[PDB]
Design a protein around this ligand. Structure first.
Ligand SMILES: *C(=O)CCCCCCCCCCCCC
Ligand SMILES: *C(=O)CCCCCCCCCCCCC
Lengths: 268, 235, 8, 60, 32, 235, 60, 32, 60, 8, 8, 8, 8
């Protein structure tokens, strides 16, 4: 644009929340599908849906994590990471069924003298591998759903051996995307790269994806967000550099069915 | 002869097949139909008829006429359940042998809305308000009116219209549910409560029965035909 | 064909 | 004498058809067409002499 | 004319009510 | 019956055949499709997506995150290679497990143009010019910029546009190449060099990584479906 | 009810055809037609909100 | 023509945004 | 922002309508009206505090 | 043929 | 026959 | 068909 | 049928 406008500079507004960025590398719309409400032709539950709109379809910022030379990577699941986020989480636990899309905005700035590259991946049905070699598909619900704080990748598979009282948790090795496939191919999934010399954010617009029109949000996660250091953090000459990564996520076109009393999950 | 090549499946016998075959009694003079009353065209027609629920399968009451009677009384208000029921139309012991339950055990999958009708069999002098609830799955199954109230319900007022119908709307993640107990396709909770209480004058009975019926709505269907477990032939 | 097939 | 009908297509790879020819003189030899009709349950669900209106009192 | 394989009836949207029509109340004694 | 004569092939079972067969669940009510995002129609769609090359399969770096990183530095100009690669998209260890390589191991033959994109992950203050080469087969594989220069290449200038793409044009004697190491259908040599050198200011890191990606061009195809060697079930 | 289509002829000895007839009522019984459509990879190769012009700077 | 006692401008309804227009970012150095 | 051109950063500017615990942590502040300011060429950032009141006018 | 072959 | 035999 | 079926 | 049956 001769009158100013650019790819690198965006403003996103949803509800009472606005995000600005002066160093973007465009935006990604997963599979080229923008979030939408459930159509009558595809509808299944017959009751009048709850649609929270601005009350739930706004930007929630999760806890800032920290990137260092030893970081192997981080992961989150949706809707799980947002389960305690304001009126979205409440509508989620009061209803049997729910569906949502998301705008995911990953934030990581640094300086013209730093370097490093984060791979940001949105994975549909991101089933991760467990820590056991004596039993399979055994990670516990509590261990599988970290909520907002997420989990992390490790560079080494180290099998839980306390057979008497098992850890019952994931053991996601980074070069295998925690699921037995090579990280180098995760680019077939909707993604963006935050390369510190180029951009300071990643923005992904995620449609609702599933084999059902609507499902149990408490039982099932539709999307996994995986962030892995494609190229390690490095700065000037400091042996221990650090920079923050902040995740802000907004539910989009979300609707809920099957109202009752609130679900009080055992999360510990 | 015409060149032909036998494909796989040849000479097999699929019991679900649909071929022609030679007739063993050629030119037989068939007796014509007459117009017998009560013809049925689809098994779902039978599922749409109300049949009585054996709500009380307690040890001394089961397999007897008593199992059909839910006893109420003029006792003071309580928020405790009169009855609790899982929405597993084919597998729950209380629904599994109703005509709906029976037809459902010849199929693997079900879908649609159901309706429960309750009949008050107390005296004309008895009055009362009750609450009939349906809670879609996923939370603590209701144990108190307070919880039950928060979901789908009907407040039934006892009077001239003897009976009351509550519709359990199709609310499911999956497009069809299984005809067996299964968490992934669980359907939720039916429960009944006293809204106020049953009130009678003097010279009137203080206890009485209600009866319950279930039938399918016009949007109900079943699929994947299968053998039932409700009959067998051990030897 | 008309002729094509005779019919009864 | 061939009979052409359409299949209600389930999972897809215009309307698709299939073809049938009867080889035998006796109709008892014929396969089942499955082209069946539905009826309404009234005669069982509502066998009452006076037509019922669901929004009005069943008993008046 | 309705065939065994025709789709079943659509659910129609319906809103709040405050009236004298009483669908929920009935009398099964009638046999219906 | 109609006179017929069975031809050869009769009663056999070809696993690649395409016949009709009787349905075991007649009149089953099929659940309709919904419009799920991300539908694929051809495996080549996946080959056209960029995936990251494990360039450094050296003993201590292989099967770890390090294998994806080609380390560069601000060292003085040299005509020696940064990396050397054989254009054997299905068989070379560096390309064989990329998404392109993986799809290619389900087919016996490949054809078309490929493209390698390199991403510079150094700091904004780092500058440099690199040369990316492709040499069609038949001569001494390039070991020095001087040789490499004489074939198909791109001189990449590092700057705001973070990445650079080199296209490897389809240049073959045969109409299709084999998905295995084979001299008759050899494809040539990919190699990367320093054109000038990487230059950084003070207070800046002197070493940094580049990443590489491969994807197929729109003129690329594969044929003769086959089983892969990239999975097995020993016992 | 016969369906006639043309073969994409490989090694030659006008267009050549083949004939198909469906014998069963259920579409699941049908063979695979192989008459399939291709789509363009955009949704995977270029899932970006702003359309990209390959001759211009990806980032501006 | 606007008089001291005319009503002030109406608030207009506005929805979600995802674009390159950046109302929020500015530069006060300009004096504006 | 009056730091140097080499300085970068992202800040969050919040407005919380009255009636709850006044925000003391980003987590609370985040839940109300806000703007995430990214520091760069455009030196400044504006957050609008929308008229949200029970009364038609507030007291000075 | 016209007659044919009946169709449904 | 005309109709139906469809052709592609 | 007319021709296509030759008849005798 | 006319067309479709090609003849040579
Ligand atoms: C109506 O049937 C006219 C078209 C006939 C088509 C060919 C029939 C295939 C062979 C059928 C022989 C019948 C065996 C009793
Ligand atoms: C459309 O099909 C009209 C032409 C029919 C041609 C002859 C069919 C050959 C025998 C098919 C019998 C079908 C078996 C279920």
């Amino acid at each position: 644009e001769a009158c100013g406008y650019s790819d690198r500079v965006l403003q996103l507004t949803l509800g009472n929340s606005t995000i600005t960025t002066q160093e973007a590398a465009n935006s990604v719309v997963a599979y080229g599908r923008w979030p939408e409400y459930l159509r009558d032709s595809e509808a299944n539950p017959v009751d009048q849906p709850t649609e929270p709109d601005v009350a739930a379809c706004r930007f929630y910022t999760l806890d800032t994590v920290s990137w260092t030379k030893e970081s192997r990577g981080w992961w989150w699941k949706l809707p799980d990471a947002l389960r305690d986020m304001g009126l979205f989480g409440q509508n989620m636990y009061y209803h049997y069924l729910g569906r949502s899309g998301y705008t995911v905005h990953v934030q990581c700035n640094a300086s013209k003298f730093h370097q490093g590259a984060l791979g940001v991946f949105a994975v549909p049905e991101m089933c991760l591998a467990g820590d056991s070699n004596t039993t399979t598909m055994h990670t516990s619900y509590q261990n599988a759903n970290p909520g907002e704080k997420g989990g992390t990748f490790t560079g080494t598979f180290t099998p839980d051996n306390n057979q008497t009282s098992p850890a019952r948790r994931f053991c996601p090795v980074d070069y295998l995307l925690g699921n037995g496939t090579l990280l180098g191919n995760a680019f077939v999934f909707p993604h963006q790269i935050i390369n510190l010399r180029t951009n300071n954010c990643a923005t992904l617009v995620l449609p609702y994806v599933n084999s059902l029109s609507i499902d149990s949000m408490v039982k099932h996660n539709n999307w996994g967000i995986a962030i892995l250091p494609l190229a390690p953090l490095n700065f000037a000459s400091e042996s221990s550099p650090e920079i923050p990564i902040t995740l802000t996520i907004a539910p989009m076109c979300c609707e809920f069915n099957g109202l009752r009393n609130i679900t009080l999950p055992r999360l510990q | 002869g015409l060149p032909v090549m036998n494909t796989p499946g040849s000479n097999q016998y699929l019991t679900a097949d649909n071929f022609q075959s030679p007739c063993a009694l050629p030119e037989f003079d068939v007796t014509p139909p007459i117009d017998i009353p009560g013809e049925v065209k689809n098994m779902m027609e039978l599922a749409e008829i109300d049949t009585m629920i054996p709500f009380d399968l307690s040890a001394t009451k089961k397999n007897t006429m008593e199992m059909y009677r839910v006893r109420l009384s003029d006792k003071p208000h309580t928020d405790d359940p009169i009855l609790c029921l899982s929405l597993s139309p084919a597998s729950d012991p209380r629904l599994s042998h109703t005509m709906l339950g029976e037809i459902l055990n010849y199929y693997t999958h079900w879908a649609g809305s159901l309706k429960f009708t309750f009949l008050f069999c107390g005296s004309m002098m008895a009055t009362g308000k009750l609450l009939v609830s349906y809670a879609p799955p996923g939370a603590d199954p209701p144990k108190k009116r307070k919880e039950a109230m928060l979901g789908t319900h009907v407040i039934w007022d006892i009077g001239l219209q003897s009976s009351c119908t509550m519709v359990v709307p199709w609310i499911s993640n999956t497009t069809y549910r299984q005809t067996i107990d299964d968490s992934f396709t669980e359907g939720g909770y039916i429960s009944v409560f006293y809204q106020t209480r049953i009130v009678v004058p003097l010279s009137t009975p203080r206890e009485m029965d209600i009866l319950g019926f279930v039938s399918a709505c016009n949007d109900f269907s079943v699929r994947l035909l299968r053998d039932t477990t409700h009959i067998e032939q051990k030897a | 064909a008309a002729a094509a097939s005779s019919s009864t | 004498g061939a009979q052409v009908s359409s299949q209600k297509v389930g999972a897809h790879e215009s309307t698709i058809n299939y073809t049938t020819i009867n080889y035998y003189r006796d109709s008892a030899s014929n396969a089942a067409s499955k082209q069946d009709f539905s009826q309404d349950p009234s005669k069982f669900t509502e066998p009452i002499k006076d037509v019922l209106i669901k929004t009005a009192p069943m008993l008046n | 004319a309705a065939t065994s394989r025709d789709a079943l009836p659509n659910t129609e949207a319906s809103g709040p009510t405050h009236s004298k029509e009483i669908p929920a109340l009935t009398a099964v004694e009638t046999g219906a």
